[PDB]
């Protein structure tokens, strides 16, 4: 079946997310683990966590379709030690928030070396991940591919594998594929050859079961732009045709599609409708 959803607001409480998900036509979702302004974040209370799990059960949300996404502050590739340390300590807290909520996945951008070098930046990420993983249990951290802006690490899937193969607990590191970041970086999912090459690269670098989530974003810019601006499904340079090709692969259908396109619940409900519209219009099986 198609597993699809969106990044959901948590400002009215975690427990409202399951209901909001089915109300936009989804059965999967992504959420921030908190709304902290700085390096310290609160845990959900026992009460909040219980309500969240109860609503999850009520609405039958598959726990393999529910993700947390870490915030913008954390940078494990930071050349600043104090930023690296604080980032490490906040990520641990975020893992513990996931544990409390029952969330199995925490998704992050690997980091930015801010112009101090990709190789040293990768080692820092690796070391940060070790400190986090070796001091926590259960939760799997997902590495997201990103756009090639500034010192971003991870715009090539090769970079995610270099990080992952050096981590102590590899089984607790997996992969998220963002279609907009990939498109920025030359990954052409608008052609079947492109999708096939993507799949082969994922299979060879990590194995296909390491692909835990797809961030389904159209792009404001052409293939290779490296611009990192998301676009509504069907309104960008990937388009209805591009996504139709992408959707035709069973390997792609196996993974939850999570929207990070502009707007909120209202706009995302439309994108979800658009996805099924594309599926119907182009005669995609299923
Ligand atoms: Zn992200």
UniProtKB/Swiss-Prot annotation:
Task: Tell me which SMART domains the record gives.
Answer: AP2Ec (SM00518)
User: What does the UniProt keyword field contain?
Assistant: DNA damage, DNA repair, Endonuclease, Hydrolase, Metal-binding, Nuclease, Zinc
Keyword Metal-binding in the entry? The reply is yes
Q: Cross-referenced PROSITE patterns, in alphabetical order?
A: AP_NUCLEASE_F2_1, AP_NUCLEASE_F2_2, AP_NUCLEASE_F2_3, AP_NUCLEASE_F2_4
Instruction: Provide the residue positions that the database annotates as binding Zn(2+) 2.
Output: 144, 178, 215, 260
Sites binding Zn(2+) 1 sit at: 69, 109, 144
EC number(s) in its UniProt entry? 3.1.21.2
Identify the NCBIfam families for this entry. Answer: nfo
Q: Give the protein family.
A: Belongs to the AP endonuclease 2 family.
Q: What is this protein called?
A: Probable endonuclease 4
Q: Which organism is it from?
A: Thermotoga maritima (strain ATCC 43589 / DSM 3109 / JCM 10099 / NBRC 100826 / MSB8)
Q: Which gene encodes it?
A: nfo
């Amino acid at each position: 079946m198609i597993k699809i959803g969106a990044h959901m607001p948590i400002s009215k409480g975690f427990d409202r997310v399951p209901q909001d998900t089915v109300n936009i036509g989804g059965n999967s979702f992504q959420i921030f683990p908190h709304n902290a302004r700085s390096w310290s974040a609160k845990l959900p209370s026992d009460e909040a966590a219980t309500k969240f799990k109860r609503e999850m059960k009520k609405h039958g949300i598959d726990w393999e379709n529910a993700f947390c996404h870490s915030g913008y502050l954390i940078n494990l590739a930071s050349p600043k030690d104090d930023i690296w340390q604080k980032s490490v300590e906040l990520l641990k807290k975020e893992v513990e928030i996931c544990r409390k909520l029952g969330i199995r996945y925490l998704n992050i951008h690997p980091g930015s070396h801010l112009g101090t070098g990709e190789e040293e930046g990768i080692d820092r990420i690796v070391r940060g991940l070790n400190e986090v993983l070796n001091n926590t249990e259960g939760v799997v951290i997902l590495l997201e591919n990103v756009s090639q802006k500034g010192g971003n690490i991870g715009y090539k899937l090769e970079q995610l594998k270099k990080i992952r193969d050096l981590v102590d607990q590899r089984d607790r590191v997996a992969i998220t594929y963002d279609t907009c970041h990939g498109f920025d970086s030359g990954y052409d999912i608008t052609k079947k050859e492109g999708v096939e090459a993507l799949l082969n690269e994922i299979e060879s670098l990590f194995g296909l079961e390491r692909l835990k989530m797809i961030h389904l974003n159209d792009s404001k810019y052409p293939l290779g732009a490296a611009k990192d601006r998301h676009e509504r499904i069907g309104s960008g340079f990937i388009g209805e045709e591009g996504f139709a090709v992408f959707f035709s692969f069973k390997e792609i259908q196996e993974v939850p599609w999570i929207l990070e396109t502009p707007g909120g619940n209202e706009e995302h409900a439309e994108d979800i409708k658009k996805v099924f519209e594309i599926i119907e219009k182009f005669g995609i099986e299923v």
